[PDB]
């Protein structure tokens, strides 16, 4: 017994072909079963034929006879069809409203999440269907991980390098950082975890959390977890106030945070607020200074990733009383300078999926581009706050969507917060980039910030661009452009001071090749988000949709504090680079 995801009419019916088994009222359930392939209906019991050795589960072919369900062949003389009168039979039949169109639900219920239009629909449908979509998507993503074959340690060639044997008949997952495995130790009659691991083409290079002397027989699977059902909306109802509500500003602030005072007051004058903070504009500084501006307020700092929460902890360690802070960790090495798992402390730092059920004066949700609607709903389910502040940048990278193959996901569809920020605009905008040379700031300001992002630094004269297609090779799931790496090598010989640079590319296999040929530390754009370096050398590698993505390209070039060299494949983005052009030797 539950509530119909389209009507909220009370019902005893859940669609049993939908992987999330959502409640559907007599009408909506009927309109759903008759217009799709979904025919299994679940009640207090399942609408299935109770005959001995019968296979009929289709609700339109079943009858309630006695107090059992039967198909036409096995029904008793007295019975009535379960699925008739434009309605499916179950409890609470009289209270039932129906919907004019079941079209959005059916599409969410039946899609395979490989078309961009699936995520577009999932972020523009009714709020209740946003929750059903976010569950259905995340369950589908978790199930797809089970499709991958087990990888088994066949030979330990060295330390940090292995030799894997793969399960027959199942595909192999890509070997990049977006796929984290878990080892398992072979035992008497079961298995135990041995940490979480990542792999890369060698043999295979493995970068695991904890070191071991792992030997043959150990194996790796992308660890899955149970997806819980959602209840809270992705955003609470907005409320605007005429005075600061539930918060008491300090009367003495320092000139370190004075630039944020007006925004801090805005935070107290509405129920939720959105803060767009481009690279290097002071997002964590903003978030910690909020605590100092409202020194009595209890604040929960949250984000999806442990690294994002830790970075808030590192900023709070600099400005806030360590005794008033606590890092929540469920039973990976994270921040360990606060007391652990103290929910009732004034400042709580905790990832979304480990959040306790509690209240707070302010909730700060950081790196919001990386959130999904599932995360948005979970936060609202766990935390009841006077104020919610969503901090991030819809021009930076989103959570990877593994199932998506047809079409690109635009920032307004990353999640509900990003949609608001791209349609009505963010409540607050951090307009001055303190990190990057002006050539880089001017580029991304025009590229993704509607010319609103201003530079703090001057031009460095150390931002260069080269147009060089090179030669693209592919391995199992990545791309390599050795001629672009050769161009960088020739550049380094003539400019050896650039050997303090970090090498960045959109592809892990490109980085592996560059690490060996150049010796520079390497980062994928996606892994570099949130970090900064004095000098960056970037090879676009290809012109794909992946390597030309403007959020990825924005993140890539905004890692640099002083200088950057971009070897570009795409003529488009090359022409957009307000960098000094260099010639190919
Ligand atoms: Zn309904
Ligand atoms: Zn269904
Ligand atoms: Zn039967």
Author numbering: 2 to 203, 208 to 336, 340 to 593
Sentences reproduced from the published study:
The SARS-CoV-2 Non-structural protein 13 (NSP13) has been identified as a target for anti-virals due to its high sequence conservation and essential role in viral replication. NSP13 is a 67 kDa protein that belongs to the helicase superfamily 1B, it utilizes the energy of nucleotide triphosphate hydrolysis to catalyze the unwinding of double-stranded DNA or RNA in a 5′ to 3′ direction. NSP13 contains 5 domains, a N-terminal Zinc binding domain (ZBD) that coordinates 3 structural Zinc ions, a helical “stalk” domain, a beta-barrel 1B domain and two “RecA like” helicase subdomains 1 A and 2 A that contain the residues responsible for nucleotide binding and hydrolysis. A long 30 amino acid linker that does not adopt any secondary structure links the 1B to the 1A and 2A RecA-like core helicase domains. The nucleotide binding site is situated in a cleft between the 1A and 2A domains with specific contacts to the nucleotide provided by conserved helicase motifs I, II, and III in the 1A domain and IV, V, and VI in the 2A domain.
We have determined the crystal structures of full-length SARS-CoV-2 NSP13 (residues 1-601) in three different forms that represent different conformations of the ATPase catalytic cycle. A phosphate-bound form was determined with the same crystal form but diffracted to significantly higher resolution (1.9 Å). In the phosphate bound structure the two phosphates bind in essentially equivalent positions to the α and γ phosphates from binding mode B, although very slight shifts are observed for the equivalent of the γ-phosphate which probably represents the expected binding poise for the hydrolyzed phosphate product. More directly related to the nucleotide status is the relative conformations adopted by the 1A and 2A domains which shifts by around 20° and adopts a closed conformation the Mg2+ AMP-PNP bound crystals structure, and a more open conformation in the APO, Phosphate bound and other AMP-PNP bound chains. The phosphate-bound NSP13 crystals show robust crystallization behavior and routinely diffract to around 2.0 Å resolution, sufficient for the reliable identification of binders. We have utilized the robust crystallization and high-resolution diffraction of the phosphate bound crystals to perform crystallographic fragment screening on NSP13. We have determined the crystal structure of SARS-CoV-2 NSP13 in APO, phosphate-bound, and nucleotide bound states. These structures are of good quality and the crystals diffract to significantly higher resolution than previous structures of related NSP13 proteins and are thus a good starting point for virtual ligand screening.
